mmCIF file with all atom_site columns, C-alpha atoms in Angstrom:
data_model
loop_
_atom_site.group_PDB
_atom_site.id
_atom_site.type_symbol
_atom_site.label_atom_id
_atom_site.label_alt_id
_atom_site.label_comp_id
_atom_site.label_asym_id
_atom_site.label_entity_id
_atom_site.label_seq_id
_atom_site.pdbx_PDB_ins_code
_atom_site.Cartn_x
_atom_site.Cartn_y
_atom_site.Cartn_z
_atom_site.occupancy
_atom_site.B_iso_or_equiv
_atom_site.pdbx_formal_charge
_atom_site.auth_seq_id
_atom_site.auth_comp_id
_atom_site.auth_asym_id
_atom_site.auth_atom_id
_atom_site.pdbx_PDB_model_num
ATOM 1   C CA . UNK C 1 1   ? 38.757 71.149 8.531   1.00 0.00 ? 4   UNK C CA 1
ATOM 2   C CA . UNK C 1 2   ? 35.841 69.071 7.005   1.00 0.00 ? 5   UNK C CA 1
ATOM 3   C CA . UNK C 1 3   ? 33.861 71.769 5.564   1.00 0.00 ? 6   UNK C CA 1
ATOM 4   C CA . UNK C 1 4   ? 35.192 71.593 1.643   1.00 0.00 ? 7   UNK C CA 1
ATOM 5   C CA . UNK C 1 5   ? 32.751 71.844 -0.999  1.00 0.00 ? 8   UNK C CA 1
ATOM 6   C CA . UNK C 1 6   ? 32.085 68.717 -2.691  1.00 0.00 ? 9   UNK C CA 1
ATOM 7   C CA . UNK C 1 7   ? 31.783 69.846 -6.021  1.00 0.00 ? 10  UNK C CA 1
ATOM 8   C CA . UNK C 1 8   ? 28.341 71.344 -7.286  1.00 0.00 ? 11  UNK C CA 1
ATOM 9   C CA . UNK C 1 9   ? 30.030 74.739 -8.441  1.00 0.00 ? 12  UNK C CA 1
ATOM 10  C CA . UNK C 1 10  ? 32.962 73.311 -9.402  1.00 0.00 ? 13  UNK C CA 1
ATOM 11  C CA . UNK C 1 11  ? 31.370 70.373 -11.019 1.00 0.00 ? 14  UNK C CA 1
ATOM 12  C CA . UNK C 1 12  ? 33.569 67.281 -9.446  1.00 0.00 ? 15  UNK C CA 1
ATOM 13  C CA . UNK C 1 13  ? 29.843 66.290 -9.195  1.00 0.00 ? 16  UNK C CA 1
ATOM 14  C CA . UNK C 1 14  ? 28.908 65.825 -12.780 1.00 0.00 ? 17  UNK C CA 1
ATOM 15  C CA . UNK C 1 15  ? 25.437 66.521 -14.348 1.00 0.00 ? 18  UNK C CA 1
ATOM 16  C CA . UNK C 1 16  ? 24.071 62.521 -14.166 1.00 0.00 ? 19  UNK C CA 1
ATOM 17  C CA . UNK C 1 17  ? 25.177 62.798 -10.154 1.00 0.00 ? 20  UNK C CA 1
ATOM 18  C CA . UNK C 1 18  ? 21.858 65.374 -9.467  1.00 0.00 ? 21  UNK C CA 1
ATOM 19  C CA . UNK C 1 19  ? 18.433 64.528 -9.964  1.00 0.00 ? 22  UNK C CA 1
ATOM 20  C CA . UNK C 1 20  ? 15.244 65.415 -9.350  1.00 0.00 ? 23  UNK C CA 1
ATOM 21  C CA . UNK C 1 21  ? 11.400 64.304 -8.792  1.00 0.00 ? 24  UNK C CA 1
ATOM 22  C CA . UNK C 1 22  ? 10.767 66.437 -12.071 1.00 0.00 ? 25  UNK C CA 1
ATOM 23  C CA . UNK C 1 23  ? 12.199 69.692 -13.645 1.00 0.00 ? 26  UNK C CA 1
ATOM 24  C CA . UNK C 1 24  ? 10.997 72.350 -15.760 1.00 0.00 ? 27  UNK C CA 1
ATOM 25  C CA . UNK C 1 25  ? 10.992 72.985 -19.548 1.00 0.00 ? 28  UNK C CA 1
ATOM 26  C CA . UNK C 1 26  ? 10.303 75.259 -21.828 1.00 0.00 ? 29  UNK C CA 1
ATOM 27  C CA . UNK C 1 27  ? 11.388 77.005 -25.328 1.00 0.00 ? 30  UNK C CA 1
ATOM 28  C CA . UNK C 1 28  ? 13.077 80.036 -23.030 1.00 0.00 ? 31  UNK C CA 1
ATOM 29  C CA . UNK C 1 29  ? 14.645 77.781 -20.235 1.00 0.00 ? 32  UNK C CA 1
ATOM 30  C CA . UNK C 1 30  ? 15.724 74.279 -19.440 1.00 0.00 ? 33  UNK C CA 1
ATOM 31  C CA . UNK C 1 31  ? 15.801 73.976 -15.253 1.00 0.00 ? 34  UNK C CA 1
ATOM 32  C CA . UNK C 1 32  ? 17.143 70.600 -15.059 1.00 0.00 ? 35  UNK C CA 1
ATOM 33  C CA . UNK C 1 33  ? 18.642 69.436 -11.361 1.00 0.00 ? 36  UNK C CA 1
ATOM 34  C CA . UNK C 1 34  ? 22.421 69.794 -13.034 1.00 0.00 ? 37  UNK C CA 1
ATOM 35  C CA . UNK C 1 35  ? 21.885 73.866 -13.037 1.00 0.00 ? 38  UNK C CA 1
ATOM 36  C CA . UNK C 1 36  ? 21.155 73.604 -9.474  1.00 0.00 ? 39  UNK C CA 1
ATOM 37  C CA . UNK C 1 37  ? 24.509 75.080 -8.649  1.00 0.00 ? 40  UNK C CA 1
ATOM 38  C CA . UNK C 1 38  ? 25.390 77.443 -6.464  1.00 0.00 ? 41  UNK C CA 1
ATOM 39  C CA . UNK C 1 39  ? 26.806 81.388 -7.993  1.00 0.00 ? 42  UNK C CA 1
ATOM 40  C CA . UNK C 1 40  ? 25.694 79.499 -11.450 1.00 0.00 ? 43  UNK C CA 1
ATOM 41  C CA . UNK C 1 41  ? 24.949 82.383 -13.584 1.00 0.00 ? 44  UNK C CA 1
ATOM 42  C CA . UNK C 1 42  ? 22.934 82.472 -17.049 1.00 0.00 ? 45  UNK C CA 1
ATOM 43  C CA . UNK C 1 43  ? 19.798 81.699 -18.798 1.00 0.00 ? 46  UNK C CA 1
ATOM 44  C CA . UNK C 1 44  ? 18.276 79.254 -16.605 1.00 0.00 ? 47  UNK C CA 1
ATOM 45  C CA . UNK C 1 45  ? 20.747 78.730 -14.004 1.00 0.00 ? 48  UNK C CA 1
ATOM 46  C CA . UNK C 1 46  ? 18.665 77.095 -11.205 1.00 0.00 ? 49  UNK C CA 1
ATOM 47  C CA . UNK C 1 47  ? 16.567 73.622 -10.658 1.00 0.00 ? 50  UNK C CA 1
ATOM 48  C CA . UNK C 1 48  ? 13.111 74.312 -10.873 1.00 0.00 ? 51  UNK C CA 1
ATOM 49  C CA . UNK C 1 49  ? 10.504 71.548 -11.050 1.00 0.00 ? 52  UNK C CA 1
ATOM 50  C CA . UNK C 1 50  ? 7.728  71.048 -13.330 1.00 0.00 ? 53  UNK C CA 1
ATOM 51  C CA . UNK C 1 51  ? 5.172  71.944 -10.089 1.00 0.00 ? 54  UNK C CA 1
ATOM 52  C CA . UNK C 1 52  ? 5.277  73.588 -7.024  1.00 0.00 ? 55  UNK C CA 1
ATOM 53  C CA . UNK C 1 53  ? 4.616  71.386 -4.256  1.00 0.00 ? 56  UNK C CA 1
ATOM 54  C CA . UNK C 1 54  ? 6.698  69.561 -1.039  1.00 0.00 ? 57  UNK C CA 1
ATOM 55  C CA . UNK C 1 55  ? 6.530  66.166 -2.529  1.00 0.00 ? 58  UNK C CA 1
ATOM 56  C CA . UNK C 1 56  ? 9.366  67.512 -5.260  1.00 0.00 ? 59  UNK C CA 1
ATOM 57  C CA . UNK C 1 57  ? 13.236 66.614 -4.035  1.00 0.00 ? 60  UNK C CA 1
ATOM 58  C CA . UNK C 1 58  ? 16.705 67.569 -5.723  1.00 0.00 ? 61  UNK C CA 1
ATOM 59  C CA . UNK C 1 59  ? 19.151 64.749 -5.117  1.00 0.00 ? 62  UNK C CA 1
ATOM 60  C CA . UNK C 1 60  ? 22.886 64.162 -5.317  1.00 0.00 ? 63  UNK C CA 1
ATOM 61  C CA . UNK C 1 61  ? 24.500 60.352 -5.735  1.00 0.00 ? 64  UNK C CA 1
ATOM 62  C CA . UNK C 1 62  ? 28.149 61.685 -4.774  1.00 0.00 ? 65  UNK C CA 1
ATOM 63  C CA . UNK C 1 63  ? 28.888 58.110 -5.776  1.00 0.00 ? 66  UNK C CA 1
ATOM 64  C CA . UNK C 1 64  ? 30.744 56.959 -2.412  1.00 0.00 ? 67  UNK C CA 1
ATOM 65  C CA . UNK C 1 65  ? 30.101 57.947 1.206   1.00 0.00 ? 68  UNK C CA 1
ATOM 66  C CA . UNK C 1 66  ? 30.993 61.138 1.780   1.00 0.00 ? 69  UNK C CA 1
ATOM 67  C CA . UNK C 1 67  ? 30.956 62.881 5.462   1.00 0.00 ? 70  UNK C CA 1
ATOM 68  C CA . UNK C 1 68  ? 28.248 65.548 5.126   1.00 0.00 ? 71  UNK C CA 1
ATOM 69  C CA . UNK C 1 69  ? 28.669 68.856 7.508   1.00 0.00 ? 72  UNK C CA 1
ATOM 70  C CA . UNK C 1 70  ? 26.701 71.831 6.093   1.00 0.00 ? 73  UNK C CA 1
ATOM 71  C CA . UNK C 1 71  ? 24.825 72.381 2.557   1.00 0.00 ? 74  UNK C CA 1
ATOM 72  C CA . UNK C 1 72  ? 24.578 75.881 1.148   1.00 0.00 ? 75  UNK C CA 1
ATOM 73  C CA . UNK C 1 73  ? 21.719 77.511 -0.879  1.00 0.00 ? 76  UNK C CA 1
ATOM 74  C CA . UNK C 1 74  ? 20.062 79.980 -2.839  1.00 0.00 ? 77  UNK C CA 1
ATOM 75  C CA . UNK C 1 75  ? 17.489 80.785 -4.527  1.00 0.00 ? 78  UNK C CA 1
ATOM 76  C CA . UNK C 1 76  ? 17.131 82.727 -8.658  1.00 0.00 ? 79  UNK C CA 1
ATOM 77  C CA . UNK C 1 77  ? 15.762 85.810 -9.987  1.00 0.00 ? 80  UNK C CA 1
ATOM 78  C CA . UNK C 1 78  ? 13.904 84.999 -13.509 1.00 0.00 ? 81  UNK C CA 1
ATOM 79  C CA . UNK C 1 79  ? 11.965 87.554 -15.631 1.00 0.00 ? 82  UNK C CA 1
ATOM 80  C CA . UNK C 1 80  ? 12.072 89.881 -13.038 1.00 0.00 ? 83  UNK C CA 1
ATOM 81  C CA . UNK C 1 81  ? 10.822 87.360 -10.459 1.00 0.00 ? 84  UNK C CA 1
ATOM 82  C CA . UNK C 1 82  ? 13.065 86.207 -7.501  1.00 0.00 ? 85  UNK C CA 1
ATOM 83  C CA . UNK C 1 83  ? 12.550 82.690 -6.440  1.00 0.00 ? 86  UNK C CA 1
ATOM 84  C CA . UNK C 1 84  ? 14.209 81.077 -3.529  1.00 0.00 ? 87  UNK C CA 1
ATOM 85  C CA . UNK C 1 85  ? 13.414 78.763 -0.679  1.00 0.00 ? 88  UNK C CA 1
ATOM 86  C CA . UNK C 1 86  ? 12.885 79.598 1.916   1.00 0.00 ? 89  UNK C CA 1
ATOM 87  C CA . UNK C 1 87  ? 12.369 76.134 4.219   1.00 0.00 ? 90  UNK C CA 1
ATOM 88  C CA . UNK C 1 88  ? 13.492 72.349 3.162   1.00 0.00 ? 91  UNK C CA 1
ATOM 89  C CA . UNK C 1 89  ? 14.067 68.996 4.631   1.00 0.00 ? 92  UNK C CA 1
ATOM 90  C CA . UNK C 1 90  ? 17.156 66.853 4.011   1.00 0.00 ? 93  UNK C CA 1
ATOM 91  C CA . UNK C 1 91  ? 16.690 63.147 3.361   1.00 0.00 ? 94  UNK C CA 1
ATOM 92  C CA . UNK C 1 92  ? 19.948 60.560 3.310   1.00 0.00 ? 95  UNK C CA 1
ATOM 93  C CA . UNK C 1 93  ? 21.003 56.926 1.932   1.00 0.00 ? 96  UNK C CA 1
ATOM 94  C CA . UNK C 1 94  ? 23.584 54.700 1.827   1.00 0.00 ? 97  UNK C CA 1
ATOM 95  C CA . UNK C 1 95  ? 21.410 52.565 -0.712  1.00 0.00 ? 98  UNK C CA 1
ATOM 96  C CA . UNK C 1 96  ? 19.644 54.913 -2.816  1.00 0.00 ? 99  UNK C CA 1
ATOM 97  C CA . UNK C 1 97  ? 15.712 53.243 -1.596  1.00 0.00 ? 100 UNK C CA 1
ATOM 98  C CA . UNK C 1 98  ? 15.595 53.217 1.666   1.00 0.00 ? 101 UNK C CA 1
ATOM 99  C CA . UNK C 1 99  ? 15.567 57.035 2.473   1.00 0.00 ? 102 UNK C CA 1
ATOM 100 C CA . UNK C 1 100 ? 16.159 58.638 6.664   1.00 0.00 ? 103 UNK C CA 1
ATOM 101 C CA . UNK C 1 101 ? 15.034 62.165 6.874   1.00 0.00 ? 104 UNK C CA 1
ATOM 102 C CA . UNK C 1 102 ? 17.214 64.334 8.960   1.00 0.00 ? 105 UNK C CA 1
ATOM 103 C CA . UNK C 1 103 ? 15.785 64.650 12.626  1.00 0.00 ? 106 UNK C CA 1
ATOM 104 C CA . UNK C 1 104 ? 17.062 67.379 15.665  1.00 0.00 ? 107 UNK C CA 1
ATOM 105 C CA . UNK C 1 105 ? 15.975 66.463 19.057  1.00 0.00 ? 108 UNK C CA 1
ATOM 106 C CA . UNK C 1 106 ? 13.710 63.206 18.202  1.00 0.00 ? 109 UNK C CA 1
ATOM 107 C CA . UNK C 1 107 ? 12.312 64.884 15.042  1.00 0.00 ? 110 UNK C CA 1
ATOM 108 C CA . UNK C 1 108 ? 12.807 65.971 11.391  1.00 0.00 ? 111 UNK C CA 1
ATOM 109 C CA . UNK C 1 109 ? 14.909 69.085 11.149  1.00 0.00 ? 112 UNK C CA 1
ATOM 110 C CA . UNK C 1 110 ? 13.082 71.938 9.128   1.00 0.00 ? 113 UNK C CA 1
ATOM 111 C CA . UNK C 1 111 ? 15.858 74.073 7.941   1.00 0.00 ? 114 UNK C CA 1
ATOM 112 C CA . UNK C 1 112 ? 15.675 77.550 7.407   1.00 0.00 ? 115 UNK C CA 1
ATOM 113 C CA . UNK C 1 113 ? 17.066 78.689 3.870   1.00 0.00 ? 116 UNK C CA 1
ATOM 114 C CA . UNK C 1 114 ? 16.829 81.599 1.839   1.00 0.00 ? 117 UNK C CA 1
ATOM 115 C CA . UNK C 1 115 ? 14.941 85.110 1.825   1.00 0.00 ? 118 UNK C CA 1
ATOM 116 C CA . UNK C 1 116 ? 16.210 86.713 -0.997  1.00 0.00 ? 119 UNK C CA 1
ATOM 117 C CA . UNK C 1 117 ? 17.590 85.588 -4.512  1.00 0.00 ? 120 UNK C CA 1
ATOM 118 C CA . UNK C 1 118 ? 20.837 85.898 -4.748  1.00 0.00 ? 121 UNK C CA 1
ATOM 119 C CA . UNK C 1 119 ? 22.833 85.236 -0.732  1.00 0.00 ? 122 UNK C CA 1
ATOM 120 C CA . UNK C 1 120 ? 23.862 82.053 0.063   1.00 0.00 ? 123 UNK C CA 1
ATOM 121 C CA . UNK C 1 121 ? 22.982 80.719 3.199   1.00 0.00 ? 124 UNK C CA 1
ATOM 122 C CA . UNK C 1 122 ? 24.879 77.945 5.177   1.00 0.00 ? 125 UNK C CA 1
ATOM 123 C CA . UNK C 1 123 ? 23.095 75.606 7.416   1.00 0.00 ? 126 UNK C CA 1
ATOM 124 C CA . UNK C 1 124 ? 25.116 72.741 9.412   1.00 0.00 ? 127 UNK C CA 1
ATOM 125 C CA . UNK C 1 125 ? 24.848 69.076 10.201  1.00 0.00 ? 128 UNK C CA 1
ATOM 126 C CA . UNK C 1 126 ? 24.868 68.258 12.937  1.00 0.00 ? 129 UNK C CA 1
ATOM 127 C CA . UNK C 1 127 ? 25.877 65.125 13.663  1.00 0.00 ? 130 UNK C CA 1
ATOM 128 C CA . UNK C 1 128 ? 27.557 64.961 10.618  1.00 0.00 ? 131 UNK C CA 1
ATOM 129 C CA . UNK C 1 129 ? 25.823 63.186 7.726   1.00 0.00 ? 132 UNK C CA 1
ATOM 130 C CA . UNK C 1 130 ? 27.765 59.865 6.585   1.00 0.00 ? 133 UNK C CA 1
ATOM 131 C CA . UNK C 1 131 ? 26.092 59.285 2.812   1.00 0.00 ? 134 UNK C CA 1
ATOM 132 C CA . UNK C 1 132 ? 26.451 58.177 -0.402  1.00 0.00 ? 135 UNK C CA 1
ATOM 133 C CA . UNK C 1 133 ? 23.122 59.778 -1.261  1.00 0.00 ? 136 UNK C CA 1
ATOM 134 C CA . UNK C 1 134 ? 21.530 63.142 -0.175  1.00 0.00 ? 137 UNK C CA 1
ATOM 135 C CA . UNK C 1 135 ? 18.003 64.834 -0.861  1.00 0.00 ? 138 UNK C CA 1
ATOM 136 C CA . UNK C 1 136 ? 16.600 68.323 -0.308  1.00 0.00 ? 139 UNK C CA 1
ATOM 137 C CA . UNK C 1 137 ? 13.192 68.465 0.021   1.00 0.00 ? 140 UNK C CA 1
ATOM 138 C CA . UNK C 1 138 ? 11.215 72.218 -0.436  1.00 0.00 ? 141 UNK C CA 1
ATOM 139 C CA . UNK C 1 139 ? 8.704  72.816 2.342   1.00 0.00 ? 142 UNK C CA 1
ATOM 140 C CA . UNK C 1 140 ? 7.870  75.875 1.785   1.00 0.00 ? 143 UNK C CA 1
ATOM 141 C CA . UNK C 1 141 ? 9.110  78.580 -1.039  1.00 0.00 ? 144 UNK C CA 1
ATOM 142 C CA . UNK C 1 142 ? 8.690  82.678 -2.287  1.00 0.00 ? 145 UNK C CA 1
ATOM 143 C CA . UNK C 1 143 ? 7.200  82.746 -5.875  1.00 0.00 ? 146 UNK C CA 1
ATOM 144 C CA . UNK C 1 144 ? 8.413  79.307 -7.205  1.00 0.00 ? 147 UNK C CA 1
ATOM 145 C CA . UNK C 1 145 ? 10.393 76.795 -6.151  1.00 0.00 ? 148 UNK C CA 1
ATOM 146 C CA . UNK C 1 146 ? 14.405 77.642 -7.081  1.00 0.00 ? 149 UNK C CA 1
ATOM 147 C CA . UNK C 1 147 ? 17.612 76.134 -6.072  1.00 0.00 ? 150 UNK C CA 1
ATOM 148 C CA . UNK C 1 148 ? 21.534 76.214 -6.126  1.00 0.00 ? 151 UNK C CA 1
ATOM 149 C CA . UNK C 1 149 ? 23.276 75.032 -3.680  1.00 0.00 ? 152 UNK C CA 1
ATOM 150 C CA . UNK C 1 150 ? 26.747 73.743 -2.482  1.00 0.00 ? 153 UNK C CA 1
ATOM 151 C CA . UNK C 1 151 ? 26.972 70.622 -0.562  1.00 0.00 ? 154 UNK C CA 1
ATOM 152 C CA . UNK C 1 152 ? 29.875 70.683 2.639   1.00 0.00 ? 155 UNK C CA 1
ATOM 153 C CA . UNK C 1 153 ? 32.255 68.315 3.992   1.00 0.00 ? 156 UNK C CA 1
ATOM 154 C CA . UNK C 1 154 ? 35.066 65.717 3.202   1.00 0.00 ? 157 UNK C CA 1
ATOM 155 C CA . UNK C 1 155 ? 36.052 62.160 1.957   1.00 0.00 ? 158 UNK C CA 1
ATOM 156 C CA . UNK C 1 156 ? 35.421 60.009 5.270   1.00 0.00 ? 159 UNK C CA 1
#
C-alpha cells in the first residue's frame, strides 16, 4: 500500500519545496532543483548543479513527516550528452539542521541509481524513512551530474 508518489511529477510538491547546494545557469538552460522531476520533458528538464562534485545535495521539505519507502530516479540527455547518476546517498531530518545519513547494516547505504538517461530506477527503504526533510547526495555520476526523481510512500 504505502508506495504512492508524493508529488515531484505531479507537483503536490511545489517548486520552493526542492532545493539544492547550487544549480546551474545559463542563457540556453536554467537547471534549478524544481526541474528535478521525474518523465519531466523539455529544455532543461533536470537539476544540475553549478559543479560536479559529492559535496552537492538536492533536497525536498515535504513540509510534514511523511513515511518514506522507495525514491525513484533518472538521469537527462542534453546536447547530445546523457547524464545520469549513477550512485547517491540519502540524508534525512525532522528539523531541517541536524541531518542522519541513511545506513544498511551499521553503515551508510550507497545506492545504486542509474546507467542510462532516460529509465527510471526504484530503490527501497528499508526501514522505512519517517521525515519531514529528505536529501540525495551524488557520489558518483556519467558525464555530469543530472537528476529527476520521484519520491515513494504515504502520509504517516
Amino acid at each position: 500500500s504505502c508506495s504512492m508518489p508524493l508529488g515531484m511529477e505531479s507537483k503536490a510538491i511545489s517548486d520552493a519545496q526542492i532545493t539544492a547546494s547550487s544549480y546551474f545557469t545559463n542563457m540556453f538552460a536554467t537547471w534549478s532543483p524544481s526541474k528535478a522531476r521525474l518523465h519531466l520533458q523539455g529544455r532543461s528538464n533536470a537539476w544540475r548543479p553549478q559543479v560536479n562534485n559529492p559535496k552537492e545535495w538536492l533536497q525536498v521539505d515535504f513540509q510534514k513527516t511523511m513515511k518514506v519507502t522507495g525514491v525513484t530516479t533518472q538521469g537527462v540527455k542534453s546536447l547530445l550528452t546523457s547524464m545520469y547518476v549513477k550512485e547517491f546517498l540519502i540524508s534525512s531530518s525532522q528539523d531541517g539542521h541536524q541531518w542522519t545519513l541513511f545506513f544498511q547494516n551499521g553503515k551508510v547505504k550507497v545506492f545504486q541509481g542509474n546507467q542510462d538517461s532516460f529509465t527510471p530506477v526504484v530503490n527501497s527503504l528499508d526501514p522505512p524513512l519517517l521525515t519531514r526533510y529528505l536529501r540525495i547526495h551524488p557520489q558518483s555520476w556519467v558525464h555530469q551530474i543530472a537528476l529527476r526523481m520521484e519520491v515513494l510512500g504515504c502520509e504517516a
